[model samples]
Target chain A: MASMERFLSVYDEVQAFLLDQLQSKYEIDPNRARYLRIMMDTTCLGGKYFRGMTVVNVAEGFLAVTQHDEATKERILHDACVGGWMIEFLQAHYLVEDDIMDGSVMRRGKPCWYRFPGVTTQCAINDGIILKSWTQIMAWHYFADRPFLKDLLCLFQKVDYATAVGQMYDVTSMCDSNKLDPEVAQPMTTDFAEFTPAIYKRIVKYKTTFYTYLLPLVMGLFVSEAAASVEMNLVERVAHLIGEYFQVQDDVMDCFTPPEQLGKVGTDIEDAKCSWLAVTFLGKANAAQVAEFKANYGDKDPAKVAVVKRLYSEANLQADFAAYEAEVVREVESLIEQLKVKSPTFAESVAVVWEKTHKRKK
Target chain B: MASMERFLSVYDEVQAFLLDQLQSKYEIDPNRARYLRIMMDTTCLGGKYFRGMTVVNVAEGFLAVTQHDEATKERILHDACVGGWMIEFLQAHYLVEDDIMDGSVMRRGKPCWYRFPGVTTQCAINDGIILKSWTQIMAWHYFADRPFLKDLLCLFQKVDYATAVGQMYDVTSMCDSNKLDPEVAQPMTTDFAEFTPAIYKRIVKYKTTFYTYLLPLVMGLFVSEAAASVEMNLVERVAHLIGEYFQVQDDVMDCFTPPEQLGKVGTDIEDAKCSWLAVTFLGKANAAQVAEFKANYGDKDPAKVAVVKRLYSEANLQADFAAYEAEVVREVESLIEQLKVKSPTFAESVAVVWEKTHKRKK
Candidate 1:
C-alpha cells in the first residue's frame, strides 16, 4: 500500500468513536446522526494532514531505532498514528474557526466547511468542538493509559492558548474599519510604521509556530518512548526555531510560488496576513514606498497584487530569504551536532525534519 | 468577611494568568497589551456561575468530609476553583459564539462580548478559542498531577462535543427565518404537528442537561476526595434525570414565567426555540389550536405572543408543568432513596441539588 493509505483505518475508528458517543449519550435522532456523520467526513477526514505526517514521522522515526518484536512495533506505530491524527484534529480545530474568523471562502480549493451544501452555520462551531474535543477523546481512549499521557494532554492544552493569543493579535491587526463595538474598535496602527518585524515574528510564533511545528514534534518524541533519552529543553528550543523558519518559508513562498505547487492558492497579500514578506518590505521602504503600499496593499485587485510582487522582486527579497535560510540551518546544525553526541542514530532522523521542510518550495 | 470572599483572590490570579500568557507569547506591543487586558475583564469574568458553583461546591464539599489540616484544605479548595472557573470559562466559550450565531445583542444584561468596545467581529472565534483552550490550560497546570486527572480531562473534552451538538440543534430550531446564507435554510418542520417532544428533549439533553447539570456534578465528584464513595453509574444516571428535569423546569418558566421574573426577556416564541412549552403545546393542541400556533408562534408582534399565551392558558399548560414537576420530584426522591442506602450524606446533598434548581425562577 501507498504510505498515505497506511492510516486509512484510523478514519473509521475515529468515526465509530464519535458516533458511539453521540448515539449513547446525546440522544442523536436521525437528523443529528446524519449531521455528525457528514461532519466527520468533511471536517476531520479530508485535511492534507501536514500535522499528522510530522507526528507519524517523528514518532515512527523514534520507534524505528528500538529493537522491539514485530507485534509490539506494529502496535506502537498504530497507536502513534492515532496520536498523529489527534494533532491533525487539533489542526482542524484551528482551521474551522480560523476560516470563519478570516472570512476564508476556499480551503484546498473547495468552498469553506461552513459554506458546504448541507451545513448549517452552527456546525461551524460544532465542527471545531468535534475536531478539538474528539481529538482528546481519542487520546484518552488510546493513550491515557500510557505514562506520558499527562505530559501529552498538558502540552496540547497549553499550546492552544498561545495559538488563540496569536490569532487574536492577527484579528486586531487585520481590519482598520469601523466595528461600532465599544470594547473592540477597528484595527490598530494600520500603517507601515506599526507593522514591524517584531509583530510579524510574534504572529508567526503564536499562530503557526507552536501548534504547527512544536506540537507534532513534541508528541512524536514523547509517544515513541524516546523523550527521556534526550534533553527536552534543547528539543523544544530547536523545534520552535525550525517552526519559525518553516512559517517564514511558507509566507515567502505564498508570494513567489505557483498555486499548483502548494496545491492551494496564496492570499497572503489579500488577507493582509502579518507575513514575513510584508514586514520585510516595511523594513526597507521609504515614505513614498510606504504610502504607495497603504493605497494598494489590502485591495484584491489583480493589478495591485502584481504591483506588490513587483516591489518585492525589486528589493531582491529572495536574497534576504536565502540569508535567513542559512541562519536556520546553522542554528539547527549546532543543535543536531550536540544531539548526535548523545544519540548517534536518532540524530539523523531528527535532522531529516529540517531537510523535509526547508527544501520545499511551497 | 464572608466565606466566599476567602477565595475571591482567584479572580485576579486567573486574570494574571491570561494576561501574562498573552503578553509573553504574543508580542503584546503595548497596543495588543491593552486589548488583552480588556478581553480578560469582560469575557472571563461575566455571567452566572452555575458551572463554577458546581466545581467549587463539590470540591469543597469533598474536602469538608476529610480530616486534612486547614492549610491543605484551603490550598485544595483554591485549586478546585480553578477547575470551577474553567467551567465558567467553557460557559463563556459557548456564550460568545451563541451570541454571534444568533446575532444576539445582549448577554448578562449587557452587550454581547462580540459587541464589546474594541472587539472585532473576528474575536467571536478568538474568544471561543480563548475560553475553550485556556480552560484546559488551567487544568493542565492545576489538576494534571491528580490520579483522576486523565478521567477529568477526558470528561471535559467529551462534553464539549455534546455541547456543540446541542448548540447546533438550537441554531437549527431558532431559525424559522429564511437563511440569508444558502447553506443554512429554515427549519425542517414548521408546523406543531411535526414538532415532536422527543426532539425537544434531545435538544435539552445535548445543550443543558449534559454541560450545565451533569458535568459540574461529575467533576465535583471526581476532583474532590469523594469519587470513591459513590457508585459512578448511579450518579451518572441520576444526574441525567435531574438535568432533564432542570431543563424541563427552565423551559416551562421561559413561556409561563414573566420575562422580568426570569431576569431577561423570554423570546422562546420569537426565537422559535425548542422549548418545553412549545413542544408540549405541540403534543396536546387540537387541529385548530395547531393552526393558531403555526400563525402566532415565532412572530415578533406583541399580539402574536399574547395570542400564544392565551392558547397556553386555555390548554392548561401550567397544569402540564405541575404534572411534570411532580414527576421530577418523584424520580429524584426515588434516586435519593437508592443513593441513601450506600451513603446518607451525599444522597442528601444530591437531593438538595434538585431542590435548589427546581425552586429557581431565573
Candidate 2:
C-alpha cells in the first residue's frame, strides 16, 4: 500500500512536465491546452498503476544495499517514480490506440479516451501518437546525462517493437471486431485455425509480457546501475513466467468479473479475441462441444454470447485457471530462488512483483 | 541524377535490414512477413525521396574537406543515406496514421494502406507504430557506438513531438473530414475562426517544416560531425522558410493539380482544409463572396466542390501562390548566402535543396 502511494506521487509531476514542455515548445492555444490536459488525465490515470509500481519497487530494493546518503537515496527513488510513470505513459498510449482498434466502449470504469465526446477518431489517433512520443521526450529530458540513457531508450524501443509485433499477431488471429465503422471494417470470420496454445503463448509474450513485465524490471536494473551485475537471462525468464500468468488472469477476469469491478467492459468473447480461455476451451473440448463453441463465438448476438459463456462454465475453467496460476507462481518462485544467489536486490524485486500479482481478483 | 540513384540504393538495403531484423527477433510467420513487406513498400516508398537525398547530399559535402580515408568517407555517406531513410520511415508512419485520421482514400496514386483488401484500421495503426520504432531501432543498432547517437535520437524525439503538436492544431482547425464513417465522425461545421494566417503558419511550421526540412538537414549535420561547427540558427531559419513555402505549394497543388499528377486525390476543398488559398481568398474576397465561399465549402456535393474551386479562381490564388514561392526562394537564398561564409559544406546542402524545391511542379 505504501508502495502504491509512493508510485502515485510522480503522476502530478509528470503531468506538469508534459504540459510545461508542450507550452514551451509549441503554440499551445487555450483550447489546445485543455484538449491535452483532458487527454493526459483520461488516458494516463485510473489504472491500478501496477506496472508503474513495479518500476518504483524494483529500484527501491537498491536502497537497502547502497552506501549512498539520504539525499542521494531520495533522488534515486524519485527518479524511479518518474521512470515508473513513463511506463504508465507507455501503457496509456497503447490503451488509447488499442481501444480504438478494438472498438471498445468502456475502459478504466469510464468511456475510452477515443469514445469521449468531442474526441473524434482523428484527434484520438493523433493524441495517441503524441502520448507515445512523451516517453522518448522524457527519456531525453530527464536522463540526458545519465550513462544508461541510451540503454533505457533502446530498452523502450525494443519493448515497443516487440509489443507491436505481438499486437500484429493478436489482430490477425482474431476476427475483426464488428463494431468498427463500415468504411474500414472487415467481414467477421470465426476461423480459429491460428489460435493454438503455442501461438497464444507467443502473442502473450510479445504483446503483454514484454511491456507489462519485462520493461519495468529492466528499466529498474538500468536505473539502479545493476544491469551489468544482474543476470538478464534470469530476469527475462521470470518476467515471462509472471507476465503470461498475469495475462491469463486478465483473460479469465474479463469473463468472470463484472465491468464495474474489472474497470473495462469485456468483449473478448464477442470480438473472438485470442484469449486464454478460448484457447483452453479449444484444446479441451470434445468434437461436438468444439463445433458448438465455434458456432456461438464471435457473433454480437446476446444469445451467442451467452452460449459461449455457458461452454466455458461447463468446462470448469475456473478450476483450470487456478491450477495454472499455482503452477506459474511455483515456477517463478524457483527462478527467483536461483536469482537470490547472484543479487538479492533483484531477487527481492522479482518477489515483490509476484506477490502483488499472485491470486489477484480484479 | 547521381544523387537520386545513390540515395535509392539504400532503400533495398533498408528493406532487407528490416526483414532480417524481424526474422531474427520475432517468429516472422510468413503471412506477417509478407504483410510487413507490403506495408514497407506502400508507406516507405513511392515518394520523391527528397528528404533522404538531403542526407546523402549533405554528407557528400564532407568528402572534399575530410581528412579521413576514402573508406571512412564512403561509410559516412552510406550512414547518411540510412539516416535519410529514417526520415522517410518517419514520414511513412505519419502518412499511414494520417490517412486513417483524414479518411483519405487515395495515397501515392493507389488506395490507402488501410483501404487494402485485408489491412484494417487496427493493423495499419499497429504497423505505423512499428514503422516509427524502426527509426530508433536503426539508431541503436547502427549508431550504437557512434559518438553522436544520442544527438541523432534526441533530434528525432524533438521533431516528432513538434510534428504531433502541429497535427493536433491541424486537426482542430478544420471541419472533420466527412469521409470518416458514422461511428467516429463529427458533424461538419464551416468554422474558419481559427484559420488565420498566423495559426496557419504555426501549423505548417510544426507539422511540415520540422520533420520535412529541419530533420534531414540536422541529421546531415549530426552524421557529418558539423552539428557543433555550423550555426543551427541559420539552418532552422532556412528550413522554416523553405518548408512553409513547400506546404503552401502543396496546398495549392491539392486544388490545382490532377490526382494523377499529385499521386493522391485532392480533398482539401471537400475536407475543408485550411489551405493557403482558402485563407487568401477569405482575406481578399468581398463580404458577398466570403458568404458564398463559406456556403460552398466542406460539402460532399459536386456542385459545392465546384463553387469552392470557382471562388479560388476568382481570387487569382495561383498568381498569389507564385508570388509567395518566389519571395520564399529569394529569402532562403539570402540566408544560404550568409551560410556560405561559415560552412560552404552546409551552404551547398541548403542550396541543392532549395534548387530542387524552387518553382516545383508535381
Q: lDDT tens string, model 1, A212-284? A: 8778777877778777777777777777788889888878877887765664567777777778888888877
Error of 2 at B65 (Å): 3.0
Cα lDDT tens digits, model 2, A53-98, are: 8878788887788789888888788778878878898999999888
| DockQ of all models, two decimals each | 0.47, 0.43
Model 1 lDDT on a 0 to 1 scale: 0.72
Ten contiguous residues minimizing lDDT sum, candidate 2 chain A: A175-184
Query: Which lDDT value does model 2 have at A361?
Result: 72
Clashing pairs in 2: none
Residue pairs that clash (backbone atoms under 3 angstroms), model 1 = A182-B117, A182-B118, A183-B116, A183-B117, A183-B118, A183-B119, A184-B117, A184-B118, A184-B119, A185-B118
Off by over 4 Å in 2: A1-3, A175-191, B175-191
lDDT (10s digit) by residue, model 2, range B1-362? 78777678888887888888788878776556766887888888888888888888888887778789888888898889889989999999999998888778889898888887668787888989989988877778778888878788889899999999988777766743222222334555565766779978998999999999999999998888888768889999999999998898888888889898888877778778788888888878898898998899977788999999998998887787777767886798899999988899889889889988875676
Model 1 interface CAPRI class = acceptable
CA-lDDT, candidates in order: 0.72, 0.83
TM-score of 2: 0.95
Interface quality of candidate 2 as DockQ? 0.43
Runs off by more than 4 Å, candidate 1: A174-184, A253-267, A299-310, A313-316, B21-34, B59-65, B173-187, B191-194, B252-267, B296-316
